[PDB]
Amino acid sequence: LGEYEGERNEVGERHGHGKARLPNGDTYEGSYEFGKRHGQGTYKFKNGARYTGDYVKNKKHGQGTFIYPDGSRYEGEWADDQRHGQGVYYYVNNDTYTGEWFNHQRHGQGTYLYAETGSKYVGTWVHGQQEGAAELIHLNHRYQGKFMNKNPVGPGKYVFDIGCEQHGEYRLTDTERGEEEEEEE
Amino acid sequence: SLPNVMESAYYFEQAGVGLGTDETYRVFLALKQLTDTHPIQRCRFWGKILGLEMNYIVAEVEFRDGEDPQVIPKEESRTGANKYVYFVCNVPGRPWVRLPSVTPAQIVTARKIKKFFTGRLDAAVISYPPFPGNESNYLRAQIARISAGTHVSPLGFYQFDSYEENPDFEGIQVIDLVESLSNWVHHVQYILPQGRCNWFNPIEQEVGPPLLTPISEDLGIQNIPSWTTQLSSNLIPQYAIAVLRSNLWPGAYAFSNGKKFENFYIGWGHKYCVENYTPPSPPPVYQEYPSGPEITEMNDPSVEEEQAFRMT
Amino acid sequence: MDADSLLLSLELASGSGQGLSPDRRASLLTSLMLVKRDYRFARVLFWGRILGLVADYYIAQGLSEDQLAPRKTLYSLNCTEWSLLPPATEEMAMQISVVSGRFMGDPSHEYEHQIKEETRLVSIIDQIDKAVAIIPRGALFKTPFGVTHVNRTFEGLPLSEVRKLSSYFHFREADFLDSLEYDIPRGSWSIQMERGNALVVLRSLLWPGLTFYHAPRTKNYGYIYVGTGEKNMDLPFML
């Protein structure tokens, strides 16, 4: 059983701002509407997980920040209790993702910062995997090509800051064929 | 102590390699200044490395005894890849500058690039991993890899970690060092893929070949053969010298008569690949917390559950 | 390089250090005298060396009265028996692009990627000659007869315009030739000097192994390529 040291409506459901302790270990100290979570609210968990953001119809729909106990952290848009919209995600070793989300799935255009390197992976993300048009930005050069499963797949276009557009396709999953053209750009 | 590098330079021109007679004598005079400046036991010509507007000239300096994520730490003193101190000169007459020591995997496993040398020590290396430090560290790491995969002695020259010179070595013929690659053995320790010459337990115990192994057992790469054996003075073969020629490292040579030997490298300091230089792949992207039973918002007790709890 | 620079031993003094032997110096002197005898070339130059796996390639080129004519290049293995290489076409140029691997030696070698070894040698020779062959300013005079002759009143390049890079041309069909400042990519030449201002060293980086000596006060120039025999397309990663 759980307790609710807040306020209720004329029917009996939870409505308005009020503290609430869930029976399985979690608690919530935000706003309630019609017996469901709605509005800006804080949701603690059993461990140190934390969500502070908007709620619509007992579901995370709105701009809010989520903290996970393993070190990952999301700030950005939520919709229908799963990740949806533009948002900024940091991972367990400061790996930064700023991009789209479809349904807990890391979709759309997304900037991936490899903070151990400083290189950027921007471009099309499909279903939590590097697939589509891609631009692997590094410090003084970048790879304008296509990724299939965390690796380049086919024809690529290599931009260098010294002024050369290296043309080359990926004949395998790992190796790169540098043939045939180098173009001034 | 200065070695006989002028007669070794005549051996170089007999093999066709070298900077010329006056330039090798000039390097000998610069090595004489280096020996007179620092208390050096052995100061031999390691070789020189080509660059964009300046070239590096490298000396294998061995000092006297007592005179002068998880990170795998550096070797303490005169062990592994830090056994020989390297001094760098641009053009002889300019003073030599001491190189730093080779560090492990933060340098060696982040070395996997293909980069020209710009002739200056204080030059940033901007590549697919962030190389720590300036171009002197990358030059030192390249010199360590060329020393590991290039310094090659005839078999029987050393007795088998450390090694000593063999006084009972009767010598080996010139024609026996050409037809068979098993008569040549590696001088110094192989660099492990961890990044050192001696394995450090991070708490796997991976190992490489021992100190004195034949180079036929470590032959690369893929379908082509390293260590081309050619015979200079093919016209007069009775007084020929066997000229080794590494294809894994272009510009790397080793020499007979076989009673004594010298090692020499001159090139761009790069390992040859049969394909093009593929860039090192970025690390795989980190996944999020798996959305399961643990990370899940409960939908709170309703008024029916509240009325069930009230009569309880 | 001519045989005069073979006499001075200037390949080692350029600093590339792959160099040449007095074996091959005397052999190129006598054998290129033979090449000038049998084939009526105006000038015969030791082109350079292609690095091998079982035998070493030695390459020399001959030129007619027209200095921009298609050269009759030659190859030799034992440095005395010079034999005439065929001219290169574009059909043989795109043929050898599917073969990636070291130059072996023994010219009847066959590549499974058939494709002959001599065709690879000739197409590689035309690629290096079309890309990184070097002529300084005022070395070649465009005659109004339509041919190109050696400028015999060529004063050597002054020290002000050694480092521009707009004072070096190509030894092929296009101050009437194309300069080095339009090479793709930019900065693909190792600009260097020797001891003092006595010699200017230019090393190609699109082909690692060609060296160009130039004394700035005398009429001494020429290109020698001794090296791997491969065009590295890794060069934008290097710079």
Report yes or no: B28 and B129 within 8 Å, Cβ to Cβ.
no
How many other CB atoms sit within 10 Å of the CB of residue C191? 16
The subunits that touch chain A, with at least 3 C-beta pairs less than 8 Å apart, are B, C
Distant-in-sequence, close-in-space partners of A154: CB < 8 Å, separation ≥ 6: A145, A146, A169, A170
- Per-residue tokens: B173: 């013929």
Q: List Cα–Cα distances, C94 to A79, A94, A169, A176, C131, in angstroms.
A: 56, 48, 17, 19, 16
Tokens coding B304: 């029916």
Distance CA A137, CA A111 (A): 10
What CA–CA distance (Å, rounded) separates C121 from B275? 19
How far apart (Å, rounded) are the C-alpha atoms in residues C142 and C32?
27
Tell me the torsion sign for CA atoms C122, C127, C128, C134.
positive
| Nearest-angstrom CA–CA distance, C191 and A100 | 48
Q: Which of C187, C233, C234 sits opposite A162 (nearest CB)?
A: C187
Q: Given an 8 Å threshold on Cβ–Cβ distance, is B298 in contact with A151?
A: no
| Cα–Cα distances in angstroms (integers) from residue B150 to residues A165, B232, B246, in the given order | 35, 19, 7
Cβ–Cβ under 8 Å, residues B96 and A87: no
Interface of A with B in 87-146 (CB under 8 A): 89, 91-93, 95, 104, 106, 112, 114, 116-119, 121, 128, 130, 136, 138-140, 143
Q: Which residue of B has its CA nearest to A169?
A: B278
Matching residue, tokens 């009526």: C40
Q: How far apart are CA C103 and CA C230, in angstroms?
A: 9
Residues of C in contact with B91 (CB under 8 A): 195
Nearest Cα of chain C lies from the Cα of B111 at a distance, in angstroms, of 13
Residue C72, SS3? strand
Q: Tell me which chain C residues have a C-beta less than 8 angstroms from the C-beta of A164.
A: 184-186, 236
Q: Give the whole-angstrom CA distance, residue C136 versus residue C170.
A: 8
Residue numbers of A between 56 and 85 with CB closer than 8 Å to C = none
How far does the CA of residue C10 sit from the closest CA of chain A (Å)?
33
* Cα→Cα distances B294→A106, B297, B301, Å: 20, 9, 18
Comparing CA positions, the residue from B68, B139, B126, B80 lying closest to residue B104 is B80
The backbone torsions φ and ψ at residue A53, rounded to the nearest 5 degrees and listed phi first, read 180, -170
Write down which chains contact chain B via at least 3 CB pairs under 8 A: A, C
Amino acid at B262: E
Contact between A178 and C233 using a beta-carbon 8 Å cutoff: yes
Nearest to C233 among A160, A162, A182 (CB): A182
Cβ distance B130 to A118 less than 8 Å, yes or no, reads: yes
